[PDB]
Amino acid sequence: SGIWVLGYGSLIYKPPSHYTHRIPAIIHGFARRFWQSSTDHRGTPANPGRVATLIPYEDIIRQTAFLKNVNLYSESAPIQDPDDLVTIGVVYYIPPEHAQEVREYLNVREQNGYTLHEVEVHLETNREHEAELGEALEQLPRHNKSGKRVLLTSVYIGTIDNEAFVGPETVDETAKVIAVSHGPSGSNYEYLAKLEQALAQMPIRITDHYLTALLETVNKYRH
């Protein structure tokens, strides 16, 4: 009926309108990296910034550089299956009356090179929301190849082929950009800090080692 929308970047802390559920989520099957350039928000055309995208398991395993980078920051290194990849984010439910607005959610945020995808995802959540997640899973009962319950969700992704994709990039390379860039929405550092704040408000303790190393390195450049 309605749609579930994954948030892994600014949708976490600047939500879509009219959601009726917002469930903190361990999202399996994707890694989140600041491998998308921003030219209208957190940088400029001549001096782009860096914003978040998600990379699916099937793309990670196809490039040695992606796989080594994911293994560098994963507690499950060397990863063996999509379930080994974890991105901490949220999932929103948008009722049918408003579902068609999903196709316009990027009009107020990072947007160049992002495309809308529908994917079945294995999610986990905290004790406070387990029952709510369980009800969500029971509406369109779906299971993956391993027998685990999955949720049909929409997500905006900067895929590996998009014009703004800049990966793979090391934390040092990305941090050097984040530490100096800004655009009409404010500094690229503020974008990173808001994401870190939003994840800290949402304890599930599962932590994002890539984002921690990225922020530590950006702080070293800013010091």
Side-chain angles (χ1 to χ4, degrees), residues 1-57 59-61 63-80 82-87 89-103 105-126 129 131-134 136-138 140-144 146-147 149-162 164-175 177-195 197-204 207-215 217-219 221-222:
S1 210
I3 77 285
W4 289 94
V5 177
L6 290 181
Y8 61 89
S10 63
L11 287 164
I12 294 174
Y13 55 79
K14 182 164 146 288
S17 313
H18 290 113
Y19 70 83
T20 61
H21 299 268
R22 177 183 187 271
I23 302 177
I26 304 174
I27 306 163
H28 288 263
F30 293 88
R32 172 176 52 222
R33 289 294 183 270
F34 275 48
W35 293 353
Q36 182 83 349
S37 63
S38 171
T39 61
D40 292 329
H41 294 83
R42 298 297 173 172
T44 68
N47 294 102
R50 301 283 186 270
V51 291
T53 186
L54 281 186
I55 309 149
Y57 175 82
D59 282 349
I60 292 165
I61 62 168
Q63 309 211 7
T64 300
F66 290 1
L67 187 52
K68 280 176 182 288
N69 175 284
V70 167
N71 283 333
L72 186 52
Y73 301 106
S74 171
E75 298 205 354
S76 295
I79 66 164
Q80 298 299 310
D83 218 60
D84 289 346
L85 290 184
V86 153
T87 297
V90 298
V91 72
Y92 289 101
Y93 182 71
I94 313 301
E97 315 85 79
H98 296 274
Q100 74 188 93
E101 287 167 26
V102 175
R103 267 184 167 74
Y105 283 170
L106 300 197
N107 289 353
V108 296
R109 60 190 82 233
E110 309 78 32
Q111 185 165 37
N112 286 314
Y114 286 90
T115 52
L116 179 60
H117 300 261
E118 276 62 50
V119 65
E120 280 176 342
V121 64
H122 177 214
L123 299 180
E124 302 163 275
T125 189
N126 56 31
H129 296 84
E132 187 179 6
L133 176 62
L137 288 165
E138 295 161 31
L140 191 38
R142 296 160 184 264
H143 308 84
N144 66 9
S146 169
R149 303 197 285 167
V150 295
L151 190 65
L152 175 64
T153 67
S154 291
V155 61
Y156 277 100
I157 294 181
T159 67
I160 72 180
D161 51 71
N162 96 85
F165 190 81
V166 293
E169 204 168 61
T170 69
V171 157
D172 189 63
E173 290 157 351
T174 304
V177 175
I178 293 175
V180 300
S181 297
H182 83 278
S185 300
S187 68
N188 198 165
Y189 171 64
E190 183 193 27
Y191 175 93
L192 176 54
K194 282 184 175 304
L195 177 56
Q197 180 186 51
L199 300 173
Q201 275 145 88
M202 216 165 42
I204 203 91
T207 70
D208 188 326
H209 298 295
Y210 164 81
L211 215 55
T212 294
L214 185 61
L215 182 52
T217 306
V218 168
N219 286 336
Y221 278 112
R222 292 180 82 250

